[PDB]
Paper text:
The truncated TPR-CHAT containing only the NTD can independently interact with the complex at the same position. When the DiCas7-11-crRNA complex bound to DiTPR-CHAT or DiTPR-CHATNTD, the conformation of the DiCas7-11-crRNA complex was unchanged. The enhanced stability of Cas7.4 (V1317-R1336) is attributed to the formation of numerous interactions with DiTPR-CHATNTD. These interactions include a pair of salt bridges formed between Cas7.4 E1330 and TPR-CHATNTD R64, four pairs of hydrogen bonds formed between Cas7.4 L1333 and TPR-CHATNTD L50, Cas7.4 L1334, and TPR-CHATNTD R53, and Cas7.4 E1330 and TPR-CHATNTD R64 (two pairs), and dozens of pairs of nonbonded contacts. In contrast, the mutations of the NTD residues Q47A and G49A that formed hydrogen bonds with S1352 and H1337, respectively, outside of the segment of V1317-R1336 in Cas7.4 neither affected the formation of the complex nor the inhibitory activity of DiTPR-CHATNTD. We found that the affinity of the DiCas7-11-crRNA complex to the target RNA was reduced by the presence of full length (F) or NTD of DiTPR-CHAT but unaffected by the CTD. The regulatory characterization of DiTPR-CHATNTD by preventing target RNA binding to Cas protein is similar to anti-CRISPR proteins (Acrs). However, it is noteworthy that the activity of DiTPR-CHATNTD has only been demonstrated in vitro, and whether it can exert a similar inhibitory effect in vivo, particularly in mammalian cells, requires further study.
The type III-E CRISPR-Cas system is a newly identified bifunctional complex with nuclease activity and protease activity that holds great potential for RNA editing applications. Here, we report cryo-electron microscopy (cryo-EM) structures of Desulfonema ishimotonii (Di) Cas7-11-crRNA, complexed with or without the full length or the N-terminus of TPR-CHAT. The Cas7 domains, arranged in a row, form a crescent-shaped filament, with the INS and CTE domain completing the structure. The Cas11 domain is positioned at the crescent’s midpoint, and interacts with Cas7.2 and Cas7.3.
Numbering used by the authors:
A (entry chain A): 1 to 132, 146 to 238, 260 to 318, 327 to 365, 392 to 691, 706 to 834, 842 to 916, 930 to 981, ...
B (entry chain B): 3 to 65
Write the structure that this text describes.
RNA sequence: UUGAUGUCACGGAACCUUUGUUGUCUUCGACAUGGGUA
């Protein structure tokens, strides 16, 4: 019998579970086990193995049933049907064997004595308890009893901490396992009941089971009736096949960023010029190809699969990169329900760290289905915190012991809230953070970390239930809910940076009275409306609104609004988005996402972290329990201020600006220093807007000292001292205003002689109207450079140093060009227009910064800031010590050579010789001849004049064939002799047997063949050797007809596509029949002239001489091949090109034929052909004094310097021992921020154009003008040799003149011929002289002499000027700067005028110069001479010479005849260092 | 400034002495720690002298 | 896979501290190329 009763549990929330423990540890002594007993257990099949499944013990259900039974008994009357139901027994003397004891107050309904321990009959409650197995609860396992690998398969562990109310920081925590309910909602079990149990007891059990509502820490309802690893290895192997190892972290970050959508792989960025050679995505098979294959794979087409694949790739790459009282209450009871929605107004961060995810430092909490979660524990903790704040009383409770009795705990022991999740499931975004060193002004060492953030706009469901004896909700709870509805709900962590502000919307409530019988029996029938259908039915019976508390306390946080005015470009860096965005730029702004439904929305903003850092730095510089700690918090205490992201009002779109670094020596662009960035546009006409707010506690607001500190800091920020964003050195992030509303004027209260003329110049230069001058010269530096070891820090405003602003005005003296390179087809032939921004003519601040820096570095004798130290120079040879040889560890040697015709119609060696031996692999047997015999039958009546006797044979077609036995029988030989008049006429009738005298001469004749010709069958050896075929390479092409081609008869022939089948057409010297020449015809070239017909043949190979090769020679040969390969002036047709340049040889190999020169032991140089280049052994950085090289430069000495990579001390090998020079101290270097900031210039009046425009109605646009060619600067002219006497001359400077008039006319400045349109030249829009511009400069912590020298470099003297823009060699862009005002700072409140100290500052600067250099100042005079502007009635003629004089109609010299004249190699440096030296 | 002391250690260093080795290791560790924790010593913007000898000695030490 | 007269664990916010910053004029004139003659 013992009829049973099946039961089940349906979990409405995730439940908690305890870990398995060893048998002996399961005792009263263990603490963790005792801390269990309320969560679910875990089973183990074998003790060593972790296999098993979860289950729930029956004693816990028994305790819940008992508790509910007591609750119902005290509630109704203690009368189940008609019986007394005594209070029961819960005490015994034997407390030693039990495992737990009751610590709560037992409940009471009657005052009668409990029933006897042994009696006839027991009450229904005592039957339920037992004490006689009348009722036996069973364990609950699962449906079907499956098995799992371990606890981690079904759930994940989590950490739960406890905070201190006084401070807001945790001090202890505990762990637990959480299991989702969507996967394991159902459990089953059974209950055994005896037949002697009373029907009243059965009804009580039924009611109690229906009343139980929470088990295992969750709501419950009781009822009774592969490619990732492969692709990772492929990409890693590819990067290792290259040497791109520094980029591993960046690539992993970009891959994890790509997880959002597979379509981003298609729209990946490429490299400039539209070619797929990106420095990341085209390292290779290539990374781009691999990502495309993984993208278009079918199985990875799925969104979630794609996401998981990208995350695993990122993890793998990051890993590689790192590698008993019995008290009554009463029968009154009500159950109040509240429902609503919790919307997120800002991002939020619920911390939850996973052990198997190391890439991100801070992670958010998610469900197994990637949905966002709002944990019950966090909601309960925030409710407790708000209640404690309301009562203004911390709870000094402790774990264990009796229950507490404070008001907060009493209110909290009636509360139930539901865990929630959202429908939005897109991946979270990522944010990066840094730490700044206050001394240098740059980031600290290794201070980088990541943060995961959830988006804003997500909506959660909310439900709260209160069970108490009051009429309704407590006043404290009403006030807290009103605060939450207002928007004072700060729930998530990282509140200082502006995370976790929620609002409660659509609130409804209803009250239920569980004292009334019908209502109670309706509640029990419906299970309390916990399931979804019951919840909907209850929602059909809810009233809107919320109550109104009586004692309403105002909130603790107050909102402060912010508005900022910005009239310059703005940027907030984000390298990853730049690494994946399709724009293709180096730096991009910050953009966040707003969650609307199931789709995001990009929006640009300014980071709250950055704003907080800026304000904190401003506060800390003009002033543990210090003020900064008290206001902004620290590691031991929470803060009292909370910032937020600032957004722009009318959404801008970004633009692009290009930059380039200029070399100080050559005056051209420095290699690998071309970059660009993408800021948001801003200007004075249409400035940017920023909106936002920040929160602050009232206690801080009611503190005069804290309000004073904040007011001072905000006043300093308002007075342009602290810009926002990055790249402030070039005029970005210049704040114009800052507003503060909503503080009752507590913080906002605190925020509220003409210049002398320049001195005239004493510099004088003599100009003659007949001579011609050069367009640039050099300035020789001084020997001594002053360096200071300790620069000035940025940590405070030092005393004795000045800070303020400088305002200037710029004037144009010659036409100026400053192009806008965004569009190169404004008018193939490229075209550009003047720089503009929001339709306003402007000049960027970087140009002016570079221009002023170039003169400051010259005035204060400093280092060459920009300089290509690692460049290597090369020179052409001119038509001795180079010997033949063959390559390896040593090089072989040959003793002699000889020539072999290959391109004449006499030899035909192609028909015979094999391809391998032509290439030089196999030996060849050839026939060398050393000297030739040259008869003259009659006595000279020559230089050597030998004697003999001739023996005539015959006379052929002209000529004379005959044997000649010279020296009277000593030597004999045959030959052919032509008729020589005055000697040949003696013998015109031949005899065939007549003998005559003869005198012989010898001439050097070194040739070789394989078959002896018909003419000379005598005196021919046969020796072994190799061949050196290089193909036709001697060619002399030009624009039009020269001189040799002019004498050609008839149309020249066609071109062969192969390099073997060429032959001569016509000799240059027709009379002597020598100097063969070849010509051919192509479509547009039309002019090729090849003058080579012999090849080279080595012989006399030796075995003894062997010479080791050095690595220096090796690298020199590598540079030689690179120079051959990269040649813009190369001949078009490859047949007329040497082998090394045609086959595109890259590295040296064994068995090749090359010339060389040697010392006693080693080899020094190697070349491929006879006349070749010579490569300098030393780099260009070693050809100058060590004190003039950059302070923080590059490695020039012999050494890879890669062994010391990834170590701290490597950086000390790239810095000067003596510190920093004045230029690097003022303008800053790579590890030191500067102390000057330049600003954008703006045109004041209306523009004046050089050429009138086509439309008279459009005065804001000008016409075009065509310039001549612009080619690269050449160091070889200034350094014309490899000898050690040659050094770097100095800094290049261009002179002022009026050559632009001829270009405006349309003629070439040199020749006067019309300019030819072509793809090479350019067309530009230029402004005329007389225009004016205005800009501003800001400095900070400067000395008197530094400020004076800066003012001098700005406004030097009258009669001098600067050079700005492009086409400086043609006379464009002469400008003059004059100072207008000089403000200064004394304190945060007072800003005086400093116009009456410029003479003192200038005098101190000159005194410092005198006390650095004892009155020599030669470079000063040279610089003043070069900056001299010609006055009226003086028109110098300045231009470059032509290549030859025949191309110059003026009759002036050219480069070829100038090299062999005034500008020879010995005086070129002296003539170039002297300013204004004529050359014609 | 640990840079001067490191220079003194290097120019006087010889690798057969464990005393010299531990002294140089201590100096390098002292410099590293000062680099990690921000201080006034980070304003020293100089480097070492005798670059070839210093490079040889540092490469020999860290290997 | 639990014992039985005693379980406030809905008895405990993974919380608190750190500026993607520093340094760079969209600038510009001297060649290239290997032999040929006796
Ligand atoms: Zn009893
Ligand atoms: Zn308490
Ligand atoms: Zn402090
Ligand atoms: Zn310097």
């Amino acid at each position: 019998m013992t009829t049973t009763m099946k039961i089940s549990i349906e979990f409405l929330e995730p439940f908690r579970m305890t870990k398995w423990q060893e048998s002996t540890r399961r005792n009263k002594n263990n603490k963790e086990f005792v801390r269990g007993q309320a969560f679910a257990r875990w089973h183990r099949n074998k003790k060593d193995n972790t296999k098993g499944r979860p289950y729930i013990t029956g004693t816990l259900l028994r305790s819940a049933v008992i508790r509910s039974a007591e609750n119902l008994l005290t509630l109704s009357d203690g009368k189940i049907s008609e019986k007394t139901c005594c209070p029961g027994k819960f005490d015994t003397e034997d407390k030693d064997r039990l495992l737990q004891l009751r610590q709560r107050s037992t409940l009471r309904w009657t005052d009668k004595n409990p029933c006897p321990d042994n009696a006839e009959t027991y009450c229904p409650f005592c039957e339920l308890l037992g004490r006689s197995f009348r009722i036996h609860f069973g364990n609950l396992s699962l449906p079907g009893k499956p098995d799992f690998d371990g606890p981690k398969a079904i759930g994940s562990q989590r950490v739960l901490n406890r905070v201190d109310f006084k401070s807001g920081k945790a001090h202890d925590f505990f762990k637990a396992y959480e299991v989702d309910h969507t996967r394991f909602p159902r459990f089953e079990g059974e209950i055994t009941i005896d037949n002697k149990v009373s029907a009243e007891a059965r009804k009580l059990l039924c009611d109690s089971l229906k009343f139980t509502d929470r088990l295992c820490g969750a709501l419950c309802v009781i009822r009774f009736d592969n490619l990732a690893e492969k692709t990772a290895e492929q990409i890693i192997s590819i990067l290792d096949d290259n040497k791109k190892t520094e980029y591993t972290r960046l690539l992993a970050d970009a891959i994890r960023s790509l997880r959002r959508s597979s379509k981003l792989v298609a729209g990946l960025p490429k490299d400039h010029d539209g070619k797929d050679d990106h420095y990341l995505w085209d390292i290779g098979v290539t990374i781009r190809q691999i990502l495309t294959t993984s993208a278009d794979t079918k199985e990875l087409k799925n969104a979630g699969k794609w996401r998981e694949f990208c995350e695993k790739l990122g993890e793998a790459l990051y890993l590689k990169s790192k590698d008993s009282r019995s008290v009554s209450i009463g029968s009154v009871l009500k159950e109040t329900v509240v429902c609503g929605e919790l919307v997120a107004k800002t991002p939020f961060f619920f911390g939850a760290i996973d052990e198997d995810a190391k890439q991100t430092d801070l992670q958010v909490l998610l469900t197994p289905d990637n949905k966002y979660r709002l944990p019950r524990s966090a909601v309960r903790g925030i409710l407790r915190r708000d209640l404690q704040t309301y009562f203004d009383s911390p709870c000094n409770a402790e774990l264990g012991g009796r229950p507490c009795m404070c008001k907060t705990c009493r209110i909290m022991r009636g509360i139930t809230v539901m865990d929630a999740r959202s429908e939005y499931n897109a991946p979270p975004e990522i944010r990066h953070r840094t730490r700044i060193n206050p001394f240098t002004g740059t980031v600290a060492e290794g201070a980088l970390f990541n943060m995961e953030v959830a988006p804003e706009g997500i909506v959660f469901p909310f439900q709260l239930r209160y069970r108490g004896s009051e009429d309704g909700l407590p006043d404290a709870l009403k006030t807290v809910l009103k605060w939450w509805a207002e928007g004072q709900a700060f729930m998530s962590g990282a509140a200082s940076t502006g995370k976790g502000r929620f609002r409660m919307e659509n609130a409804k409530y209803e009250t239920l009275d569980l004292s009334d019988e019908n209502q109670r029996n309706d509640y029990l029938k419906n299970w309390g409306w916990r399931d979804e259908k019951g919840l909907e039915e209850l929602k059909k019976r809810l009233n809107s609104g919320l109550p109104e508390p009586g004692n309403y306390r105002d909130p603790k946080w107050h909102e402060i609004n912010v508005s900022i005015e910005m009239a310059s470009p703005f940027i907030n860096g984000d390298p990853i988005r730049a690494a994946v965005d399709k724009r293709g730029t180096d730096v991009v702004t910050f953009v966040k996402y707003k969650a609307e439904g199931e789709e995001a929305k990009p929006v640009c903003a300014y980071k709250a972290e950055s704003f907080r850092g800026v304000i904190r730095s401003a506060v800390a510089r003009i002033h543990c329990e210090c003020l900064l700690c008290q206001i902004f918090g620290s590691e031991y205490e929470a803060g009292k201020i909370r910032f937020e992201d600032l957004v722009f009002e009318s959404d801008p779109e970004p633009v692009t600006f290009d930059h380039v670094a200029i070399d100080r020596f050559t005056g051209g662009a420095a290699d690998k220093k071309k970059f660009d960035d993408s800021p948001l546009p801003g200007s004075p006409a249409r400035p940017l807007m920023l909106k936002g707010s920040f929160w602050i506690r009232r206690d801080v607001l009611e503190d005069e000292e804290y309000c004073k500190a904040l007011g001072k800091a905000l006043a300093d920020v308002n007075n342009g001292l602290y810009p926002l964003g990055g790249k402030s050195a070039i005029g970005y992030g210049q704040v114009k205003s800052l507003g503060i509303k909503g503080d009752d004027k507590r913080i906002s209260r605190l925020m509220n002689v003409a210049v002398p003329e320049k001195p005239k110049t004493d510099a004088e230069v003599r100009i003659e109207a007949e001579k011609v001058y050069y367009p640039h010269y050099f300035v020789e530096p001084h020997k001594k450079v002053e360096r200071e070891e300790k620069p000035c820090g940025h940590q405070k405003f030092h005393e004795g140093r000045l800070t303020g602003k400088i305002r200037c005005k710029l004037i144009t003296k010659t036409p100026l060009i400053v192009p806008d390179t965004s569009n190169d087809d404004f008018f193939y032939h490229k075209s550009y227009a003047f720089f503009r921004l929001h339709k306003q003519i402007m000049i960027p601040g970087s140009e002016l910064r570079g221009m002023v820096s170039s003169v400051y570095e010259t005035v204060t004798n400093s280092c060459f800031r920009i300089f290509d130290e690692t460049k290597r120079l090369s020179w052409r040879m001119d038509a001795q010590d180079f010997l033949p040889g063959r390559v390896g560890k040593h090089i072989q040697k040959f003793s002699e050579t000889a020539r072999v015709p290959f391109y004449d119609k006499t030899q035909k060696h192609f028909d015979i010789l094999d391809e391998q031996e032509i290439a030089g692999e196999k030996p060849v047997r050839m026939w060398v001849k050393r000297f030739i015999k040259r008869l003259s039958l009659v006595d000279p009546a020559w230089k050597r004049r030998k004697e003999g006797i001739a023996t005539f044979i015959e006379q052929k077609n002209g000529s004379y064939y005959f044997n000649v036995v010279t020296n009277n029988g000593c030597t004999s030989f045959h030959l052919w002799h032509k008729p020589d008049n005055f000697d040949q006429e003696k013998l015109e009738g031949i005899q065939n047997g007549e003998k005559l005298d003869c005198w012989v001469r010898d001439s050097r004749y070194q040739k070789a063949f394989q078959e002896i010709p018909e003419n000379d069958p005598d005196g021919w050896e046969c020796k072994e050797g190799y061949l050196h075929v290089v193909g036709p390479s001697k060619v002399e092409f030009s624009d039009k007809k020269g001189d040799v081609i002019n004498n050609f008869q008839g149309t020249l022939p066609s071109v062969p596509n192969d390099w073997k089948t060429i032959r001569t057409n016509d000799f240059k010297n027709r009379k002597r029949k020598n100097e063969p020449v070849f010509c051919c015809e192509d479509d547009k070239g039309n002019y090729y002239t090849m003058a080579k017909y012999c090849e080279t043949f080595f012989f006399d190979l030796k075995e003894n001489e062997e010479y080791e090769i050095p690595e220096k020679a090796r690298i020199k040969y590598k540079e030689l091949l690179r120079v051959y390969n990269n040649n813009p002036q190369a001949v078009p047709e490859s047949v007329f090109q040497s082998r090394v340049a045609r086959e595109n040889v890259e590295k040296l190999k064994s068995g090749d034929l090359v010339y060389f020169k040697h010392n006693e032991k080693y080899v020094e140089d190697i070349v491929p052909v006879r006349i070749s280049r010579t490569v300098d052994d030393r780099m260009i950085g070693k050809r100058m004094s060590a004190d003039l090289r950059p302070c923080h430069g590059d490695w020039v000495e012999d050494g890879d310097l890669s062994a010391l990579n990834a170590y701290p001390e490597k950086r000390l090998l790239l810095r000067h021992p003596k510190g920093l020079c004045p230029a690097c101290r003022l303008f800053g270097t790579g590890s030191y921020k500067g102390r000057v900031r330049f600003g954008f210039a703006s045109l004041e009046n209306d523009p004046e154009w050089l050429i009138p425009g086509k439309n008279p109605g459009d005065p804001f646009h000008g016409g075009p003008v065509m310039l001549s060619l612009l080619e690269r600067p050449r160091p070889t002219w200034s350094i014309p040799g490899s000898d050690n006497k040659f050094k770097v001359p100095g800094r290049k400077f261009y002179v002022h003149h009026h050559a632009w008039k001829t270009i405006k006319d349309g003629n070439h400045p040199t020749t006067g011929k019309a300019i030819e349109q072509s793809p090479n030249n350019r067309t530009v829009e230029a402004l005329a002289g007389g225009n004016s511009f205005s800009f501003e400069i800001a400095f900070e912590n400067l000395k008197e002499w530094e400020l004076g020298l800066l003012i001098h470099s700005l406004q030097l003297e009258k009669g001098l000027a600067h050079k700005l823009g492009m086409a400086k060699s043609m006379g464009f862009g002469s400008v003059e700067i004059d100072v207008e005002s000089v403000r200064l700072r004394k304190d945060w409140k007072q800003w005086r005028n400093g116009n009456s100290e410029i003479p003192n500052w200038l005098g101190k600067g000159f005194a410092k110069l005198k006390e650095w250099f004892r009155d020599e100042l030669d470079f000063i005079e040279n610089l003043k001479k070069l900056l001299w502007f010609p006055e009226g009635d003086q028109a110098p003629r300045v231009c470059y010479p032509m290549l030859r004089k025949k191309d110059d109609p003026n009759g002036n010299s050219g480069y070829e005849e100038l090299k062999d004249g005034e500008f020879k190699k010995e005086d070129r440096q002296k003539k170039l260092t002297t300013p204004w030296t004529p050359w014609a | 400034n640990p840079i001067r002391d490191i220079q003194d250690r290097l120019k006087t260093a010889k690798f057969d002495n464990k005393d010299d080795m531990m002294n140089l290791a201590s100096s390098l560790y002292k410099y590293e720690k000062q680099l990690m924790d921000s201080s006034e010593a980070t304003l020293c913007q100089q480097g070492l002298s005798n670059r070839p000898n210093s490079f040889s000695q540092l490469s020999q030490f860290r290997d």
